[PDB]
Design a protein around this ligand. Sequence first.
Ligand SMILES: CP(=O)(O)N[C@@H](CC(=O)O)C(=O)O
Ligand SMILES: CP(=O)(O)N[C@@H](CC(=O)O)C(=O)O
Ligand SMILES: [Zn+2]
Lengths: 301, 301
Amino acid sequence: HIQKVAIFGGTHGNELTGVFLVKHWLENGAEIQRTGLEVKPFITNPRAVKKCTRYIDCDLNRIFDLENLGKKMSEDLPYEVRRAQEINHLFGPKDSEDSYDIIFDLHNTTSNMGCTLILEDSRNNFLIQMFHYIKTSLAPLPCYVYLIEHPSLKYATTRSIAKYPVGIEVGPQPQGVLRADILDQMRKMIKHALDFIHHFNEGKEFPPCAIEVYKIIEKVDYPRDENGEIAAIIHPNLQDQDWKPLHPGDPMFLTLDGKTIPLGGDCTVYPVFVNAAAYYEKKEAFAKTTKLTLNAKSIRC
Amino acid sequence: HIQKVAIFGGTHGNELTGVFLVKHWLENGAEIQRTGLEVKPFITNPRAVKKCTRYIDCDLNRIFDLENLGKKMSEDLPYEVRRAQEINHLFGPKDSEDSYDIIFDLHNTTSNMGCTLILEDSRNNFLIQMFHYIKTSLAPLPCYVYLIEHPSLKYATTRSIAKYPVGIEVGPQPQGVLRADILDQMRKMIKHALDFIHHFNEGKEFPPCAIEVYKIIEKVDYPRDENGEIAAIIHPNLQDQDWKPLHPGDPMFLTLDGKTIPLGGDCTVYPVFVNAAAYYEKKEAFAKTTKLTLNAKSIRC
Ligand SMILES: CP(=O)(O)N[C@@H](CC(=O)O)C(=O)O
Ligand SMILES: CP(=O)(O)N[C@@H](CC(=O)O)C(=O)O
Ligand SMILES: [Zn+2]
Protein backbone atom coordinates (compact mmCIF):
# COMPACT_ATOMS: atom_id res chain seq x y z
CA HIS A 1 0.00 0.00 0.00
CA ILE A 2 2.73 2.51 1.03
CA GLN A 3 5.21 3.28 -1.76
CA LYS A 4 6.78 6.73 -1.71
CA VAL A 5 8.37 7.93 1.53
CA ALA A 6 10.60 11.00 1.98
CA ILE A 7 12.67 12.48 4.79
CA PHE A 8 13.11 16.21 5.03
CA GLY A 9 15.98 17.96 6.72
CA GLY A 10 16.89 21.62 6.85
CA THR A 11 13.35 23.02 6.75
CA HIS A 12 14.92 25.48 9.17
CA GLY A 13 18.59 25.93 8.46
CA ASN A 14 19.83 26.22 12.05
CA GLU A 15 18.28 22.87 13.17
CA LEU A 16 21.29 20.73 12.35
CA THR A 17 20.37 17.18 13.41
CA GLY A 18 18.11 16.81 10.36
CA VAL A 19 20.67 18.46 8.09
CA PHE A 20 23.42 16.10 9.18
CA LEU A 21 21.42 12.91 9.04
CA VAL A 22 20.03 13.78 5.61
CA LYS A 23 23.42 14.73 4.14
CA HIS A 24 24.94 11.50 5.54
CA TRP A 25 22.12 9.45 4.02
CA LEU A 26 22.35 11.11 0.61
CA GLU A 27 25.90 9.76 0.40
CA ASN A 28 24.93 6.46 2.04
CA GLY A 29 21.26 5.78 2.82
CA ALA A 30 21.43 2.06 3.54
CA GLU A 31 20.36 2.80 7.12
CA ILE A 32 16.97 4.04 5.96
CA GLN A 33 16.38 1.57 3.13
CA ARG A 34 13.75 -1.09 3.70
CA THR A 35 12.93 -4.01 1.36
CA GLY A 36 10.13 -3.16 -1.10
CA LEU A 37 10.25 0.47 0.04
CA GLU A 38 11.75 3.55 -1.68
CA VAL A 39 12.75 6.21 0.88
CA LYS A 40 14.25 9.54 -0.29
CA PRO A 41 16.23 11.95 1.91
CA PHE A 42 16.11 15.59 0.88
CA ILE A 43 17.22 19.01 2.08
CA THR A 44 14.25 21.35 1.92
CA ASN A 45 15.88 24.76 2.52
CA PRO A 46 19.53 24.54 1.32
CA ARG A 47 19.97 28.31 1.23
CA ALA A 48 19.09 28.70 4.93
CA VAL A 49 21.26 25.73 5.82
CA LYS A 50 24.21 27.39 4.06
CA LYS A 51 23.77 30.52 6.21
CA CYS A 52 22.90 28.45 9.31
CA THR A 53 19.72 30.51 9.78
CA ARG A 54 16.05 29.71 10.36
CA TYR A 55 14.90 31.15 7.02
CA ILE A 56 15.96 33.60 4.28
CA ASP A 57 12.85 35.66 3.46
CA CYS A 58 9.98 33.85 5.26
CA ASP A 59 9.39 30.65 7.27
CA LEU A 60 9.29 27.69 4.87
CA ASN A 61 7.18 25.64 7.24
CA ARG A 62 4.02 27.76 7.12
CA ILE A 63 3.45 28.49 3.42
CA PHE A 64 2.45 25.15 1.86
CA ASP A 65 -1.12 26.32 1.19
CA LEU A 66 -3.15 27.48 -1.81
CA GLU A 67 -2.44 31.14 -1.15
CA ASN A 68 1.28 30.53 -1.80
CA LEU A 69 1.64 27.34 -3.84
CA GLY A 70 -0.75 28.74 -6.45
CA LYS A 71 1.21 31.95 -7.08
CA LYS A 72 2.74 32.59 -10.46
CA MET A 73 6.40 31.54 -10.44
CA SER A 74 8.86 34.44 -10.70
CA GLU A 75 12.28 35.55 -9.39
CA ASP A 76 10.56 38.39 -7.48
CA LEU A 77 8.95 35.92 -5.07
CA PRO A 78 10.47 35.34 -1.61
CA TYR A 79 13.07 32.56 -1.82
CA GLU A 80 11.08 30.13 0.32
CA VAL A 81 7.93 30.56 -1.80
CA ARG A 82 9.87 29.60 -4.94
CA ARG A 83 11.36 26.71 -2.98
CA ALA A 84 7.99 25.58 -1.59
CA GLN A 85 6.73 25.27 -5.17
CA GLU A 86 9.79 23.31 -6.34
CA ILE A 87 9.22 20.88 -3.46
CA ASN A 88 5.47 20.56 -4.07
CA HIS A 89 6.31 19.68 -7.67
CA LEU A 90 8.87 17.07 -6.57
CA PHE A 91 7.10 15.32 -3.72
CA GLY A 92 3.50 16.41 -4.36
CA PRO A 93 1.39 17.98 -5.69
CA LYS A 94 -0.48 18.41 -2.41
CA ASP A 95 -4.04 16.99 -2.18
CA SER A 96 -3.11 14.84 -5.20
CA GLU A 97 -2.91 11.06 -5.41
CA ASP A 98 0.51 11.32 -7.06
CA SER A 99 1.89 12.93 -3.90
CA TYR A 100 4.26 10.99 -1.72
CA ASP A 101 2.51 8.74 0.75
CA ILE A 102 4.54 9.61 3.86
CA ILE A 103 6.95 12.45 4.66
CA PHE A 104 9.01 12.86 7.79
CA ASP A 105 10.05 16.42 8.47
CA LEU A 106 12.90 16.66 10.98
CA HIS A 107 13.22 19.42 13.55
CA ASN A 108 15.09 20.53 16.65
CA THR A 109 14.01 22.77 19.52
CA THR A 110 15.83 24.40 22.42
CA SER A 111 12.94 23.33 24.62
CA ASN A 112 13.49 20.36 26.92
CA MET A 113 11.01 18.08 25.12
CA GLY A 114 12.93 14.97 24.08
CA CYS A 115 11.50 12.74 21.38
CA THR A 116 8.37 14.39 20.01
CA LEU A 117 5.98 13.25 17.30
CA ILE A 118 3.66 15.74 15.69
CA LEU A 119 0.15 14.74 14.66
CA GLU A 120 -1.96 16.88 12.32
CA ASP A 121 -5.14 14.74 12.21
CA SER A 122 -6.60 13.21 15.41
CA ARG A 123 -8.89 10.84 13.53
CA ASN A 124 -6.10 9.21 11.49
CA ASN A 125 -5.80 5.54 12.39
CA PHE A 126 -2.66 4.90 10.33
CA LEU A 127 -0.61 7.59 12.02
CA ILE A 128 -1.82 6.85 15.52
CA GLN A 129 -0.81 3.23 15.03
CA MET A 130 2.62 4.29 13.79
CA PHE A 131 3.03 6.70 16.66
CA HIS A 132 1.99 3.95 19.05
CA TYR A 133 4.56 1.57 17.61
CA ILE A 134 7.33 4.15 17.85
CA LYS A 135 6.36 5.19 21.38
CA THR A 136 6.29 1.60 22.51
CA SER A 137 9.49 0.65 20.73
CA LEU A 138 11.42 3.53 22.32
CA ALA A 139 10.30 2.68 25.89
CA PRO A 140 11.56 3.25 28.55
CA LEU A 141 12.86 6.30 26.61
CA PRO A 142 9.97 8.72 26.74
CA CYS A 143 8.28 9.81 23.50
CA TYR A 144 5.49 12.37 23.40
CA VAL A 145 2.80 13.22 20.90
CA TYR A 146 1.69 16.77 20.19
CA LEU A 147 -1.60 17.35 18.38
CA ILE A 148 -1.95 20.52 16.29
CA GLU A 149 -5.55 19.97 15.18
CA HIS A 150 -7.46 23.17 15.68
CA PRO A 151 -10.36 24.81 13.80
CA SER A 152 -8.56 28.16 13.02
CA LEU A 153 -4.95 27.36 14.00
CA LYS A 154 -2.72 24.60 12.49
CA TYR A 155 -0.27 25.52 9.72
CA ALA A 156 0.54 24.68 6.11
CA THR A 157 3.68 22.70 6.87
CA THR A 158 6.33 21.25 4.55
CA ARG A 159 5.35 17.67 5.34
CA SER A 160 1.65 18.47 4.78
CA ILE A 161 2.12 17.57 1.09
CA ALA A 162 1.88 13.89 2.02
CA LYS A 163 -1.19 11.71 2.51
CA TYR A 164 0.36 11.08 5.93
CA PRO A 165 2.48 14.00 7.19
CA VAL A 166 4.75 13.10 10.12
CA GLY A 167 6.62 15.67 12.19
CA ILE A 168 9.67 14.80 14.26
CA GLU A 169 11.13 17.10 16.92
CA VAL A 170 13.93 16.49 19.40
CA GLY A 171 15.12 18.82 22.14
CA PRO A 172 16.82 20.35 23.95
CA GLN A 173 19.47 21.44 21.43
CA PRO A 174 20.67 24.96 20.77
CA GLN A 175 20.37 26.37 17.26
CA GLY A 176 23.53 25.97 15.20
CA VAL A 177 24.70 23.15 17.46
CA LEU A 178 24.90 19.45 16.78
CA ARG A 179 24.69 17.22 19.84
CA ALA A 180 25.31 13.48 19.59
CA ASP A 181 22.65 12.28 22.06
CA ILE A 182 19.93 14.28 20.26
CA LEU A 183 21.09 12.90 16.96
CA ASP A 184 21.02 9.35 18.32
CA GLN A 185 17.45 9.88 19.61
CA MET A 186 16.20 11.07 16.20
CA ARG A 187 17.91 8.11 14.48
CA LYS A 188 16.05 5.66 16.72
CA MET A 189 12.78 7.50 16.11
CA ILE A 190 13.28 7.07 12.39
CA LYS A 191 14.32 3.42 12.42
CA HIS A 192 11.15 2.42 14.27
CA ALA A 193 8.99 4.61 12.03
CA LEU A 194 10.43 2.83 8.98
CA ASP A 195 10.22 -0.56 10.71
CA PHE A 196 6.51 0.12 11.25
CA ILE A 197 5.92 0.90 7.57
CA HIS A 198 7.77 -2.26 6.53
CA HIS A 199 5.83 -4.39 9.07
CA PHE A 200 2.68 -2.86 7.58
CA ASN A 201 3.65 -3.50 3.95
CA GLU A 202 4.41 -7.13 4.88
CA GLY A 203 0.74 -7.10 5.86
CA LYS A 204 1.03 -7.28 9.66
CA GLU A 205 -2.26 -6.70 11.47
CA PHE A 206 -2.21 -4.18 14.30
CA PRO A 207 -4.81 -4.44 17.07
CA PRO A 208 -6.65 -1.34 18.19
CA CYS A 209 -4.60 0.93 20.46
CA ALA A 210 -4.73 4.09 22.52
CA ILE A 211 -2.20 6.91 23.04
CA GLU A 212 -1.97 10.08 25.12
CA VAL A 213 -1.58 13.19 22.97
CA TYR A 214 -1.26 16.83 23.94
CA LYS A 215 -3.70 19.11 22.16
CA ILE A 216 -2.65 22.70 21.64
CA ILE A 217 -5.21 25.19 22.91
CA GLU A 218 -3.39 28.54 23.25
CA LYS A 219 0.07 30.16 22.93
CA VAL A 220 1.09 32.27 25.94
CA ASP A 221 2.79 35.64 25.43
CA TYR A 222 5.54 36.98 27.65
CA PRO A 223 4.26 39.85 29.75
CA ARG A 224 5.38 43.09 28.10
CA ASP A 225 6.03 46.75 28.96
CA GLU A 226 4.57 50.09 27.76
CA ASN A 227 7.19 50.05 25.01
CA GLY A 228 6.26 46.45 24.12
CA GLU A 229 9.49 44.75 25.22
CA ILE A 230 9.50 41.54 27.31
CA ALA A 231 9.11 42.10 31.05
CA ALA A 232 9.49 38.68 32.70
CA ILE A 233 11.07 35.30 32.05
CA ILE A 234 10.19 31.63 32.45
CA HIS A 235 10.17 30.95 36.20
CA PRO A 236 12.91 28.53 37.39
CA ASN A 237 10.32 25.90 38.31
CA LEU A 238 8.86 25.96 34.82
CA GLN A 239 12.24 25.91 33.04
CA ASP A 240 12.80 22.53 31.37
CA GLN A 241 9.48 21.15 32.72
CA ASP A 242 7.84 20.56 29.35
CA TRP A 243 4.94 18.07 29.31
CA LYS A 244 4.59 18.16 33.11
CA PRO A 245 1.34 19.38 34.68
CA LEU A 246 0.99 23.02 35.76
CA HIS A 247 -1.83 24.01 38.14
CA PRO A 248 -3.43 27.52 38.44
CA GLY A 249 -1.56 28.18 41.70
CA ASP A 250 1.87 27.40 40.27
CA PRO A 251 4.61 29.92 39.27
CA MET A 252 4.88 30.87 35.59
CA PHE A 253 7.06 33.94 35.07
CA LEU A 254 9.53 36.01 37.08
CA THR A 255 10.43 39.72 36.87
CA LEU A 256 13.98 40.95 37.46
CA ASP A 257 12.83 42.13 40.90
CA GLY A 258 11.54 39.42 41.06
CA LYS A 259 7.91 39.03 41.95
CA THR A 260 6.43 35.79 40.60
CA ILE A 261 3.45 35.72 38.23
CA PRO A 262 1.39 32.57 38.76
CA LEU A 263 -0.66 30.60 36.22
CA GLY A 264 -4.31 31.65 36.68
CA GLY A 265 -7.37 30.14 35.00
CA ASP A 266 -9.34 27.29 36.61
CA CYS A 267 -7.70 24.07 35.25
CA THR A 268 -4.43 22.14 34.97
CA VAL A 269 -2.48 22.66 31.73
CA TYR A 270 0.54 21.02 30.14
CA PRO A 271 3.12 23.49 28.82
CA VAL A 272 5.22 22.61 25.78
CA PHE A 273 7.87 24.48 23.84
CA VAL A 274 8.86 26.12 27.13
CA ASN A 275 11.30 28.99 26.47
CA ALA A 276 11.69 27.89 22.85
CA ALA A 277 13.99 30.17 20.88
CA ALA A 278 11.63 30.22 17.89
CA TYR A 279 8.94 31.55 20.23
CA TYR A 280 10.98 34.70 21.15
CA GLU A 281 10.86 36.00 17.59
CA LYS A 282 7.07 36.30 18.05
CA LYS A 283 7.53 36.99 21.83
CA GLU A 284 5.77 33.86 23.07
CA ALA A 285 6.60 32.00 26.28
CA PHE A 286 5.19 28.55 25.59
CA ALA A 287 2.14 26.59 24.42
CA LYS A 288 -0.75 25.51 26.65
CA THR A 289 -1.82 21.97 25.84
CA THR A 290 -4.53 19.64 27.02
CA LYS A 291 -3.57 16.03 27.65
CA LEU A 292 -6.00 13.42 26.30
CA THR A 293 -6.20 9.90 24.88
CA LEU A 294 -6.90 8.94 21.26
CA ASN A 295 -7.93 5.57 19.81
CA ALA A 296 -7.22 3.72 16.57
CA LYS A 297 -8.82 0.70 14.90
CA SER A 298 -6.98 -2.24 13.34
CA ILE A 299 -5.21 -1.95 9.93
CA ARG A 300 -3.74 -4.05 7.01
CA CYS A 301 -2.21 -4.99 3.60
CA HIS B 1 41.97 54.69 43.22
CA ILE B 2 39.28 53.08 40.97
CA GLN B 3 36.80 55.61 39.58
CA LYS B 4 35.32 54.80 36.18
CA VAL B 5 33.66 51.38 35.80
CA ALA B 6 31.42 50.23 32.93
CA ILE B 7 29.30 47.18 32.17
CA PHE B 8 28.83 46.06 28.60
CA GLY B 9 25.92 44.05 27.32
CA GLY B 10 24.97 43.07 23.82
CA THR B 11 28.50 42.78 22.44
CA HIS B 12 26.87 39.87 20.65
CA GLY B 13 23.20 40.52 20.04
CA ASN B 14 21.92 36.98 20.61
CA GLU B 15 23.48 36.68 24.10
CA LEU B 16 20.48 38.02 25.99
CA THR B 17 21.41 37.81 29.69
CA GLY B 18 23.73 40.83 29.30
CA VAL B 19 21.18 42.69 27.18
CA PHE B 20 18.43 42.22 29.74
CA LEU B 21 20.47 43.11 32.79
CA VAL B 22 21.90 46.20 31.11
CA LYS B 23 18.54 47.45 29.85
CA HIS B 24 17.02 46.90 33.31
CA TRP B 25 19.87 48.81 34.93
CA LEU B 26 19.68 51.73 32.51
CA GLU B 27 16.13 52.29 33.79
CA ASN B 28 17.14 51.52 37.33
CA GLY B 29 20.77 50.85 38.18
CA ALA B 30 20.55 51.03 41.96
CA GLU B 31 21.58 47.36 42.11
CA ILE B 32 24.99 48.12 40.63
CA GLN B 33 25.59 51.44 42.37
CA ARG B 34 28.13 51.39 45.16
CA THR B 35 29.13 54.25 47.43
CA GLY B 36 31.86 56.51 45.99
CA LEU B 37 31.73 54.58 42.72
CA GLU B 38 30.13 55.40 39.37
CA VAL B 39 29.34 52.35 37.23
CA LYS B 40 27.81 52.85 33.79
CA PRO B 41 25.79 50.15 31.99
CA PHE B 42 25.90 50.30 28.23
CA ILE B 43 24.74 48.34 25.20
CA THR B 44 27.69 47.88 22.88
CA ASN B 45 26.02 46.49 19.73
CA PRO B 46 22.40 47.80 19.66
CA ARG B 47 21.92 46.94 15.98
CA ALA B 48 22.72 43.24 16.48
CA VAL B 49 20.55 43.16 19.60
CA LYS B 50 17.66 44.56 17.51
CA LYS B 51 17.99 41.67 15.07
CA CYS B 52 18.85 39.14 17.81
CA THR B 53 21.99 38.12 15.91
CA ARG B 54 25.67 37.69 16.81
CA TYR B 55 26.87 40.55 14.60
CA ILE B 56 25.85 42.61 11.59
CA ASP B 57 28.94 42.83 9.37
CA CYS B 58 31.80 41.51 11.54
CA ASP B 59 32.38 40.33 15.14
CA LEU B 60 32.53 43.37 17.44
CA ASN B 61 34.64 41.54 20.01
CA ARG B 62 37.65 40.98 17.76
CA ILE B 63 38.31 44.44 16.31
CA PHE B 64 39.43 46.75 19.16
CA ASP B 65 42.98 47.00 17.79
CA LEU B 66 45.06 49.53 15.82
CA GLU B 67 44.19 47.91 12.50
CA ASN B 68 40.53 48.88 12.98
CA LEU B 69 40.33 51.67 15.55
CA GLY B 70 42.75 53.74 13.45
CA LYS B 71 40.70 53.64 10.25
CA LYS B 72 39.19 56.84 8.90
CA MET B 73 35.58 57.16 9.98
CA SER B 74 33.07 56.81 7.11
CA GLU B 75 29.62 55.30 6.35
CA ASP B 76 31.30 52.75 4.03
CA LEU B 77 32.90 50.97 7.00
CA PRO B 78 31.34 47.80 8.41
CA TYR B 79 28.80 48.72 11.09
CA GLU B 80 30.81 47.20 13.96
CA VAL B 81 33.96 49.09 13.00
CA ARG B 82 32.08 52.41 13.19
CA ARG B 83 30.62 51.26 16.48
CA ALA B 84 33.98 50.11 17.89
CA GLN B 85 35.32 53.60 17.30
CA GLU B 86 32.31 55.28 18.96
CA ILE B 87 32.85 53.08 22.01
CA ASN B 88 36.62 53.66 22.14
CA HIS B 89 35.85 57.39 22.12
CA LEU B 90 33.32 56.98 24.95
CA PHE B 91 35.06 54.63 27.32
CA GLY B 92 38.65 54.92 26.08
CA PRO B 93 40.73 55.80 24.20
CA LYS B 94 42.57 52.49 24.56
CA ASP B 95 46.16 52.56 25.92
CA SER B 96 45.27 56.02 27.34
CA GLU B 97 45.08 57.14 30.98
CA ASP B 98 41.69 58.74 30.34
CA SER B 99 40.26 55.31 29.56
CA TYR B 100 37.84 53.70 32.01
CA ASP B 101 39.55 51.85 34.83
CA ILE B 102 37.47 48.65 34.73
CA ILE B 103 35.05 47.23 32.18
CA PHE B 104 32.92 44.12 32.55
CA ASP B 105 31.84 42.63 29.25
CA LEU B 106 28.95 40.18 29.61
CA HIS B 107 28.54 37.03 27.55
CA ASN B 108 26.66 33.79 27.21
CA THR B 109 27.72 30.47 25.72
CA THR B 110 25.87 27.29 24.82
CA SER B 111 28.78 25.38 26.38
CA ASN B 112 28.20 23.85 29.79
CA MET B 113 30.70 26.10 31.59
CA GLY B 114 28.77 27.86 34.36
CA CYS B 115 30.22 30.99 35.88
CA THR B 116 33.39 31.90 34.00
CA LEU B 117 35.83 34.76 34.45
CA ILE B 118 38.17 35.71 31.64
CA LEU B 119 41.68 36.93 32.38
CA GLU B 120 43.83 38.66 29.75
CA ASP B 121 47.01 39.26 31.84
CA SER B 122 48.45 36.52 34.08
CA ARG B 123 50.81 38.88 35.92
CA ASN B 124 48.03 41.26 37.03
CA ASN B 125 47.70 41.25 40.83
CA PHE B 126 44.57 43.43 40.96
CA LEU B 127 42.50 41.17 38.71
CA ILE B 128 43.68 37.95 40.29
CA GLN B 129 42.67 39.27 43.69
CA MET B 130 39.25 40.26 42.32
CA PHE B 131 38.82 36.90 40.66
CA HIS B 132 39.82 35.21 43.91
CA TYR B 133 37.23 37.18 45.86
CA ILE B 134 34.48 36.37 43.38
CA LYS B 135 35.42 32.66 43.17
CA THR B 136 35.43 32.25 46.95
CA SER B 137 32.28 34.40 47.44
CA LEU B 138 30.28 32.25 45.01
CA ALA B 139 31.20 28.94 46.66
CA PRO B 140 29.83 26.27 46.71
CA LEU B 141 28.69 27.50 43.29
CA PRO B 142 31.58 26.71 40.99
CA CYS B 143 33.40 29.54 39.20
CA TYR B 144 36.25 29.02 36.74
CA VAL B 145 38.99 31.24 35.34
CA TYR B 146 40.10 31.09 31.73
CA LEU B 147 43.41 32.69 30.74
CA ILE B 148 43.83 34.01 27.18
CA GLU B 149 47.45 35.11 27.47
CA HIS B 150 49.36 33.68 24.55
CA PRO B 151 52.47 34.63 22.62
CA SER B 152 51.06 33.64 19.19
CA LEU B 153 47.40 34.59 19.77
CA LYS B 154 45.50 37.84 19.94
CA TYR B 155 42.05 38.96 21.01
CA ALA B 156 41.27 42.69 20.66
CA THR B 157 38.17 42.53 22.79
CA THR B 158 35.59 45.15 23.64
CA ARG B 159 36.59 45.29 27.28
CA SER B 160 40.31 45.56 26.34
CA ILE B 161 39.92 49.36 26.29
CA ALA B 162 40.15 49.37 30.12
CA LYS B 163 43.22 49.36 32.38
CA TYR B 164 41.60 46.25 33.84
CA PRO B 165 39.46 44.36 31.30
CA VAL B 166 37.15 41.75 32.88
CA GLY B 167 35.24 39.15 30.87
CA ILE B 168 32.15 37.38 32.22
CA GLU B 169 30.64 34.30 30.62
CA VAL B 170 27.80 32.06 31.79
CA GLY B 171 26.60 28.86 30.16
CA PRO B 172 24.89 26.77 29.10
CA GLN B 173 22.26 29.01 27.48
CA PRO B 174 21.06 28.81 23.89
CA GLN B 175 21.38 31.87 21.70
CA GLY B 176 18.22 33.99 21.58
CA VAL B 177 17.07 32.48 24.86
CA LEU B 178 16.86 34.04 28.30
CA ARG B 179 17.03 31.57 31.19
CA ALA B 180 16.41 32.69 34.78
CA ASP B 181 19.09 30.59 36.52
CA ILE B 182 21.79 31.84 34.12
CA LEU B 183 20.64 35.42 34.67
CA ASP B 184 20.74 34.94 38.43
CA GLN B 185 24.29 33.52 38.22
CA MET B 186 25.60 36.50 36.25
CA ARG B 187 23.97 38.89 38.73
CA LYS B 188 25.77 37.28 41.63
CA MET B 189 29.05 37.38 39.69
CA ILE B 190 28.60 41.11 39.19
CA LYS B 191 27.57 41.90 42.74
CA HIS B 192 30.70 40.30 44.19
CA ALA B 193 32.89 41.96 41.54
CA LEU B 194 31.47 45.36 42.52
CA ASP B 195 31.66 44.48 46.24
CA PHE B 196 35.36 43.76 45.74
CA ILE B 197 36.00 47.14 44.09
CA HIS B 198 34.16 48.91 46.92
CA HIS B 199 36.05 46.93 49.60
CA PHE B 200 39.24 47.98 47.77
CA ASN B 201 38.29 51.69 47.50
CA GLU B 202 37.48 51.67 51.24
CA GLY B 203 41.15 50.68 51.48
CA LYS B 204 40.84 47.04 52.57
CA GLU B 205 44.12 45.11 52.43
CA PHE B 206 44.05 41.75 50.71
CA PRO B 207 46.64 39.11 51.64
CA PRO B 208 48.50 37.25 48.91
CA CYS B 209 46.44 34.52 47.23
CA ALA B 210 46.55 31.74 44.63
CA ILE B 211 44.01 30.61 42.00
CA GLU B 212 43.78 27.90 39.38
CA VAL B 213 43.38 29.23 35.86
CA TYR B 214 43.04 27.42 32.55
CA LYS B 215 45.49 28.60 29.93
CA ILE B 216 44.46 28.28 26.34
CA ILE B 217 47.02 26.45 24.20
CA GLU B 218 45.09 25.82 20.97
CA LYS B 219 41.68 25.40 19.36
CA VAL B 220 40.66 21.99 18.01
CA ASP B 221 38.98 21.75 14.62
CA TYR B 222 36.23 19.29 13.80
CA PRO B 223 37.55 16.57 11.50
CA ARG B 224 36.43 17.50 8.00
CA ASP B 225 35.14 15.98 4.74
CA GLU B 226 36.96 15.72 1.44
CA ASN B 227 34.83 18.75 0.49
CA GLY B 228 35.60 20.58 3.76
CA GLU B 229 32.34 19.91 5.64
CA ILE B 230 32.29 18.61 9.25
CA ALA B 231 32.68 14.83 9.55
CA ALA B 232 32.28 14.01 13.27
CA ILE B 233 30.68 15.43 16.41
CA ILE B 234 31.54 15.85 20.08
CA HIS B 235 31.51 12.36 21.59
CA PRO B 236 28.74 11.79 24.20
CA ASN B 237 31.31 11.42 26.99
CA LEU B 238 32.82 14.80 26.17
CA GLN B 239 29.48 16.63 25.80
CA ASP B 240 28.90 19.00 28.72
CA GLN B 241 32.20 17.96 30.38
CA ASP B 242 33.85 21.37 30.19
CA TRP B 243 36.77 21.96 32.60
CA LYS B 244 37.10 18.24 33.36
CA PRO B 245 40.32 16.41 32.55
CA LEU B 246 40.66 14.54 29.26
CA HIS B 247 43.49 11.99 28.85
CA PRO B 248 45.08 10.86 25.52
CA GLY B 249 43.19 7.54 25.64
CA ASP B 250 39.77 9.16 26.04
CA PRO B 251 37.04 9.55 23.33
CA MET B 252 36.81 12.93 21.58
CA PHE B 253 34.66 12.75 18.44
CA LEU B 254 32.18 10.36 16.85
CA THR B 255 31.30 9.73 13.19
CA LEU B 256 27.75 8.89 12.15
CA ASP B 257 29.02 5.37 11.43
CA GLY B 258 30.05 4.55 14.99
CA LYS B 259 33.81 5.01 14.94
CA THR B 260 35.22 6.95 17.90
CA ILE B 261 38.23 9.25 17.46
CA PRO B 262 40.25 9.43 20.68
CA LEU B 263 42.33 12.33 22.01
CA GLY B 264 46.00 11.62 21.22
CA GLY B 265 48.94 13.81 22.14
CA ASP B 266 50.97 12.85 25.21
CA CYS B 267 49.37 14.78 28.12
CA THR B 268 46.10 15.48 29.95
CA VAL B 269 44.18 18.51 28.69
CA TYR B 270 41.18 20.46 29.90
CA PRO B 271 38.61 21.20 27.20
CA VAL B 272 36.53 24.37 27.36
CA PHE B 273 33.86 25.83 25.09
CA VAL B 274 32.86 22.27 24.26
CA ASN B 275 30.41 22.25 21.31
CA ALA B 276 30.03 26.03 21.53
CA ALA B 277 27.74 27.42 18.84
CA ALA B 278 30.11 30.31 18.14
CA TYR B 279 32.82 27.75 17.40
CA TYR B 280 30.81 26.15 14.52
CA GLU B 281 30.93 29.36 12.51
CA LYS B 282 34.71 28.84 12.30
CA LYS B 283 34.26 25.03 12.44
CA GLU B 284 36.02 24.48 15.79
CA ALA B 285 35.15 21.76 18.32
CA PHE B 286 36.55 23.19 21.55
CA ALA B 287 39.61 24.77 23.19
CA LYS B 288 42.49 22.82 24.73
CA THR B 289 43.58 24.38 28.00
CA THR B 290 46.33 23.73 30.48
CA LYS B 291 45.37 23.98 34.19
CA LEU B 292 47.80 25.89 36.40
CA THR B 293 48.03 28.10 39.51
CA LEU B 294 48.73 31.84 39.61
CA ASN B 295 49.79 34.00 42.55
CA ALA B 296 49.10 37.60 43.61
CA LYS B 297 50.69 39.95 46.14
CA SER B 298 48.86 42.18 48.62
CA ILE B 299 47.12 45.43 47.52
CA ARG B 300 45.97 48.86 48.91
CA CYS B 301 44.68 52.48 48.68
C1 LIG C 1 10.63 25.01 17.03
P1 LIG C 1 10.08 24.69 15.32
O1 LIG C 1 10.73 25.67 14.42
O2 LIG C 1 10.55 23.22 14.86
N1 LIG C 1 8.33 24.87 15.22
C2 LIG C 1 7.65 24.78 13.94
C3 LIG C 1 6.50 23.77 14.02
C4 LIG C 1 6.85 22.41 13.43
O3 LIG C 1 8.02 21.98 13.54
O4 LIG C 1 5.96 21.75 12.86
C5 LIG C 1 7.16 26.13 13.47
O5 LIG C 1 6.60 26.88 14.31
O6 LIG C 1 7.34 26.44 12.27
C1 LIG D 1 30.14 32.72 23.20
P1 LIG D 1 31.16 34.22 23.08
O1 LIG D 1 31.00 34.81 21.74
O2 LIG D 1 30.78 35.34 24.15
N1 LIG D 1 32.83 33.77 23.38
C2 LIG D 1 33.88 33.91 22.38
C3 LIG D 1 35.15 34.24 23.17
C4 LIG D 1 34.92 35.49 24.01
O3 LIG D 1 33.83 36.10 23.91
O4 LIG D 1 35.82 35.89 24.79
C5 LIG D 1 33.98 32.68 21.51
O5 LIG D 1 33.72 31.56 22.01
O6 LIG D 1 34.28 32.77 20.29
ZN1 LIG E 1 11.68 23.63 13.28
